[PDB]
């Protein structure tokens, strides 16, 4: 839950997709980072605040971004200046979500209890109540400052509250041009606390002394340029309007307001160790809309990194591409769709659907749709979750095709040793995952493109152990689909229906015949010395072993030769001539294998001898058993295995 921050974000995205009212994609971002910083502060250890401080700041930024995207878009045709409205959006997040010390404890009853008659600790208790009131007013606590000013006998501060309440009645209107020049002159008079000296300059739009700013934090530090522009833009337009008159004016005001970049050149220069933090500098880029300019700049200095930034920049583009179509750079979009799917490795199991909302071109083309062919191995949970998100047809025909064609180039080293052994454990451990993508795509129409993948690996077996026999067992783990591919094949029209349905049916008969010979050869070899002294059951079983084999040989010779001779698709004939030429000698030795173990019973001698001696004699009428010796090299092997019967049968 709390640990899976990415999962929470994904859920919010999913809800929006179901609905497809558009301002709800970013509002859910305020419920994630909040519960996280709350789960490390409600109960638990106190040292977790070293990580909760990162969550205590990533949530206030999502609040400031929600007011900027709705002002420049949701312009309803209801019943002027569009750039001055940004100052109001900056004041809402700069006033509501600010730090405020609570009310002071042990407030004195009467005044001057220790009594130039007051001690040094009396102006401090007066400045303590002065700072408690100088802070609440800066955060918009009129409702609280108005009661706070009346409560502490602090009547010296109430005279300006209504002056602000009179300035608030003039701001809602959108004379007082002379009242702005008196407080600035009051800020140049001596005799004021440091907290009250900064309060008079902040309301008008002036700069106070630097000794009061030293205490001021570099984050808060930004309200100085915000209040000056307001005091100057209203005096400019106010000046333009001139609704006070020249006489009402007293002193010249800096009515030349600067831009955002000239103000940011000074806030990150007063307290740069914290004003340029990676979670606070993102608010200037929302006014510039440059997405891949802050993350792709941390991949070059590899000689000398922050996961919270990659999750927000990538989540911004899915909204930036949606808020304004193509607002995110097209290069940045595909660079964000690729950096997200790659960084989402520890959490790639559930986000296999959230990457489709911004398909764009990385998904329509074989770009962002080929990475799923690298993790879908054994677990059946991720294979079924991708079935949602409204994706099928060609995407299913492009993920299954990219799953079997992308591993065919890696088996190129498996066709070089045509006369030696090799390391086939990886092929016997990675090709098993190469059959779950097609077995999961239970489509009777997309069966022709995958039914040939097993026959394409018969030549990688070569001598010694064969990989097709183990591959024949993977197909037995999911048969019956032959009935689904034969019924769905009569649904779509096809012209060459006299050769496409005959190759699939003949390959299934040879493979099932091959899987049967492998299991028949595993039961006679596992016999060894079975039945012990009671060979009566073996006298009939070995009789069945010797009959089922003498029949299997004549049957396997007729299945491979059933391909006739002259055919146009001779590429399928030159590949099956070796597999047929490789299943011949292994049968004659099994009857002879009853002359090493069943030789303790002089019964397989007169039988297994002539049974294998004529196996080459009748293998001379059907075109001399073709030339299985010409396709494998096993000629003298047959000459010696049978020649040995002249020192045992006599």
């Amino acid at each position: 839950y709390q640990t899976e921050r990415f999962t929470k974000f994904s859920d919010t995205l999913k809800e929006f997709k179901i609905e497809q009212d558009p301002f709800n994609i970013i509002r859910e971002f305020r419920s994630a980072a909040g519960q996280l910083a709350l789960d490390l502060a409600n109960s638990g250890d106190e040292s977790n605040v070293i990580s909760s401080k990162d969550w205590e700041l990533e949530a206030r930024f999502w609040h400031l971004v929600e007011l900027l995207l709705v002002f420049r878009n949701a312009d309803l045709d209801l019943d002027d200046n569009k750039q001055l409205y940004q100052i109001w959006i900056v004041m809402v997040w700069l006033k509501e979500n600010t730090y405020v010390m609570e009310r002071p404890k042990n407030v004195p009853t009467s005044k001057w209890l220790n009594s130039n008659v007051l001690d040094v600790k009396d102006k401090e208790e007066d400045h303590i109540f002065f700072k408690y009131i100088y802070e609440l007013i800066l955060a918009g606590a009129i409702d609280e400052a108005l009661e706070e000013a009346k409560l502490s006998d602090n009547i010296s501060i109430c005279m300006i509250l209504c002056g602000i309440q009179e300035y608030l009645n003039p701001v809602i209107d959108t004379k007082h041009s002379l009242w702005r020049r008196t407080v600035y002159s009051l800020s140049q008079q001596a005799g004021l606390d440091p907290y009250e000296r900064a309060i008079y300059s902040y309301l008008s739009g002036a700069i106070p002394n630097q000794e009061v700013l030293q205490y001021s934090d570099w984050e808060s530090d930004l309200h100085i340029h915000l209040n000056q522009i307001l005091q100057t833009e209203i005096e400019n337009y106010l000046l333009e309007n001139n609704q006070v008159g020249t006489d009402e004016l007293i002193l010249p005001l800096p009515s030349h307001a600067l831009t955002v970049q000239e103000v940011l050149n000074r806030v990150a220069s007063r307290h740069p160790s914290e004003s340029e933090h990676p979670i606070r500098v993102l608010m200037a880029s929302v006014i510039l809309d440059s997405l891949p300019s802050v993350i792709h700049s941390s991949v070059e200095m590899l000689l000398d990194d922050k996961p919270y930034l990659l999750r927000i920049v990538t989540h911004l583009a899915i909204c930036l591409d949606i808020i304004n179509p193509g607002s995110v750079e097209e290069v940045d979009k595909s660079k964000l769709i690729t950096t997200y799917i790659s960084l989402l490795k520890l959490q790639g199991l559930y986000e296999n659907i959230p990457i489709y909302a911004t398909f764009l071109n990385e998904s329509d083309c074989l770009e962002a749709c080929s990475f799923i062919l690298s993790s879908l191995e054994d677990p059946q949970v991720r294979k079924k979750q991708i079935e949602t998100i409204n994706f099928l047809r060609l995407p299913a025909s492009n993920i299954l095709r990219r799953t079997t064609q992308r591993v065919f180039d890696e088996t190129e080293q498996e066709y070089s040793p045509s006369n030696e052994i090799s390391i086939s454990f990886d092929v016997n451990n990675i090709d098993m995952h190469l059959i779950y993508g097609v077995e999961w795509l239970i489509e009777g129409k997309l069966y022709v493109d995958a039914v040939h993948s097993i026959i394409a690996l018969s030549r990688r077996f070569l001598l010694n152990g064969r990989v097709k026999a183990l591959e024949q067992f993977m197909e037995r783990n999911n048969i019956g689909e032959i009935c689904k591919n034969y019924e769905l094949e009569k649904i779509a029209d096809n012209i060459s229906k006299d050769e496409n349905e005959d190759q699939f049916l003949e390959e299934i008969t040879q493979y099932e015949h091959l899987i049967k010979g492998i299991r028949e050869y595993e039961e006679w070899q596992k016999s060894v010395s079975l039945l012990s002294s009671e060979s009566n059951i073996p006298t009939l079983i070995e009789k069945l072993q010797g009959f089922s084999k003498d029949t299997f040989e004549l049957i396997k010779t007729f299945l491979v030769d059933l391909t006739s001779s002259n055919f146009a698709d001779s590429a399928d004939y030159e590949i099956l001539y070796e597999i047929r030429a490789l299943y011949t000698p292994f049968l004659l030795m099994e009857l002879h294998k009853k002359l090493v173990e069943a030789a303790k019973l002089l019964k397989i001698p007169k039988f297994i001898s002539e049974a294998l001696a004529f196996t080459s004699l009748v293998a001379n009428e059907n075109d001399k058993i073709y030339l299985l010796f010409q396709s494998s090299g096993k000629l003298k092997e047959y000459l010696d295995l049978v020649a040995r019967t002249a020192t045992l049968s006599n």
Partner: nanobody
Amino acid sequence: QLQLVETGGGLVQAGGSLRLSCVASGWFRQAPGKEREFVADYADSVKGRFTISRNNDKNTVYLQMNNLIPEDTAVYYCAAGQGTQVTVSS
């Protein structure tokens, strides 16, 4: 430390009334599963039935919810809050 103390929520029937008071120790709604939407300016789903409690200067101007329906069962938060549950049974 904007101790925003909210109270007044509860469980009512379809058609009842409630009065949510919010005292800023120093009105948006969230349904179960959806995103935080603004209630009180008045939302189109509560215009004519609710009365917001926003006041100028130091004036809470606390006001309620009349003719409550099952579409208003959610957690209400205050903004200028921890949350107060207001459920309405059908």
